[PDB]
Paper text:
[name] ribonucleases bind cOA using a CARF (CRISPR-associated Rossmann Fold) domain, resulting in activation of a fused HEPN (Higher Eukaryotes and Prokaryotes Nucleotide binding) ribonuclease domain. Here we characterised the cyclic hexa-adenylate (cA6) activated [name]’ ribonuclease from the industrially important bacterium [name]. StCsm6’ is symmetrical dimer, with each monomer displaying a CARF domain (residues 1–173), a central 6H domain (residues 174–239), and a HEPN domain (residues 240–386). In the dimer, each domain interacts with the equivalent domain in the other monomer, but they cross over each other at the 6H domains to give an ‘X’ arrangement.
Author numbering:
A (entry chain A): 0 to 14, 17 to 67, 69 to 133, 149 to 288, 301 to 332, 338 to 386
B (entry chain B): 1 to 122, 125 to 134, 147 to 172, 176 to 235, 238 to 288, 299 to 308, 314 to 329, 336 to 386
Write the structure that this text describes.
């Protein structure tokens, strides 16, 4: 990797103490002295060099002269950004660092450098500087090894990630872990990366597989619990999203899973929903038939290739009878019915 | 409402022959809310700026907002300081309903920079006006651009939205309509925007309730369905919802194997797939894999089952095309819609 200072050369460069460029270049000690001079920054072409080189021998750089800058369009706003946005675009800096040495030059440039660096969503440093050719280049106030380095970098989020974060966040809170996941995998290194990713990752993987997610692998009463929880929220979570045709499947599963669970106990089996429906009466069932009814009104009603509109309610009304249904047959908890709410709350706040 | 948050700089109106940034910019884009945050120096020309503004032309005098806090002359040349000072100013009136211009010309250059910084970083726009006390009427009357016909050198340049766009692209390119939708939903107005959304929405809506997308509605009535369901199943596999495939495939075969014996011999004898498997010695060798997926209890799918979710897809795929001639002109619908969509977004 090498360091390229994609920095211009205004009135300040190169000159008791040196100029932002001199300092900028001198302090960061790079391997690419990118210089995009302008109409006035012609003159300084001559000495600017003599400065950069003559600072210290046996420390030789790349001094690449930039399309001269536009003696008129060097105080033009959007132009400044357009030129520079290109200038940055030129040397993409795949595996090197850009020294956006935007401390010196014409206002527009300075502003523009910043907006570039600050915008520029990747590893590229934006920088500032706080305030006889060979003659001056001898008595330079920072012409030694151990000098007061006034160079101080920006150290921002890049703001690229900002949108990324926000935009990925809104999905996690939107209940869309798949969305969130992808968002996140784009996101460049960040502490709470692992915890966001790893978390999202475990949630993702688990859901698809049809296992308990190995996060909500809580101390439940065997598979029947974990799975019974895992499903119970697979449908809930699901219903949260969109898949209003997922419900039917999930429910009709559980509607059975538990249906067979209770039947397995009361009147030990001793052998569809109509198998439930019939079994309900004769086999120590009465109150369960009321419960299991609407549940079994949806599954039969659901059944062509059309989709009713009262079903959009029947789904809802199905859920309460499926939530309520499970609470009875198994005594879970609202503390353990927040699995993902927690996940989201730990998650969201881990994002922040 | 169009409300420009303009600085109150020294070269205000009375800035030579032509009109002066503030008043200049203001006229050009005729705003309804002439937002002005005036600092210590510019505090003098507080009244004048009112005269010129209003005296620019009648039947177009907006309610101007004198900035709530006086600007301090310690933040004149103030670099980042003004950036903050700006940062808050913008935040004060988010007015996502309305739109804003950040007058490039304003006053101290730092405040300028900030005004830019504010605008670049992130609904409201801004453009400066390229170059050429107590005058009052003297200034206004003999104004060099003080007449309806004037040269509009106030020309502004034209990021986050772009980034969001691409962000939302990939989702469409991943075949995630909900995603794409979302990132669109928030997105602002654009030329393709309507269509990119409109279709997206119709496809989500179309996929939502058991019906067939507007586009996909081009075959007979049912054939639309028999097929318009399939691509459902195909879209499924795309985004790893393996769980959905089984019941789609299942519903698929039988919706067809039945709608195939409807005419090839009405028969009576829910009609389970086990029933169809009995009722065509040749057919009963092609729909074997679909009957292989017949045989869970809250349990998961072993590594192998994900294969079955595939051989069956080849079972149902070839099953679709065989019994109904459709052609790869159909089962590219979404392959195209991607390309239409993506082309569109461009």
């Amino acid at each position: 990797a090498m360091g390229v200072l994609i920095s211009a050369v205004g009135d300040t460069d190169p000159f008791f103490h040196d100029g932002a460029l001199i300092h900028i270049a001198r302090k960061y000690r790079p391997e690419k002295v990118i210089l995009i001079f302008s109409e006035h920054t012609a003159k300084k072409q001559g000495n600017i060099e003599k400065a950069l080189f003559s600072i210290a021998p046996n420390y030789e750089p790349e001094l690449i002269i930039h399309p001269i800058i536009s003696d008129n369009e060097v105080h033009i706003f959007d132009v400044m950004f357009q030129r520079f946005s290109d200038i940055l675009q030129e040397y993409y800096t795949k595996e090197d660092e850009f020294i956006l040495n935007l401390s010196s030059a014409t206002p527009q440039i300075k502003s523009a450098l910043f907006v570039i660096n600050r915008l520029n969503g990747i590893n590229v440093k934006a920088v500032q500087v706080s305030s006889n050719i060979d003659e001056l280049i001898e008595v330079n106030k920072d012409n030694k090894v151990n000098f007061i380095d006034r160079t101080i970098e920006d150290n921002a989020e890049k703001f690229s990630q900002a949108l990324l974060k926000k935009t990925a966040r809104d999905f996690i809170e939107k209940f869309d872990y798949k969305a969130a996941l992808d968002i996140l995998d784009q996101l460049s290194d960040f502490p709470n990366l692992k915890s966001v990713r790893e978390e999202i990752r475990d949630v993702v993987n688990c859901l698809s597989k049809q296992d308990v997610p190995k996060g909500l692998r809580h101390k439940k009463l065997k598979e029947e619990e974990q799975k019974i929880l895992s499903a119970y929220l697979t449908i809930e979570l699901q219903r949260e999203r969109g898949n209003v045709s997922e419900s039917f499947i999930r429910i009709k599963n559980l509607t059975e899973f538990i249906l067979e669970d209770y039947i397995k106990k009361r009147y030990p089996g001793l052998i569809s929903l109509f198998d439930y429906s019939k079994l309900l009466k004769a086999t120590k069932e009465f109150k369960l038939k009321r419960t299991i009814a609407p549940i079994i009104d949806m599954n039969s009603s659901r059944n062509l290739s059309p989709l009713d509109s009262d079903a959009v309610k029947q789904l809802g009304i199905a859920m309460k009878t499926l939530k309520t249904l499970v609470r009875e047959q198994y005594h879970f908890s609202q503390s353990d019915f927040n699995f993902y709410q927690d996940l989201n709350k730990i998650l969201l706040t881990k994002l922040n």
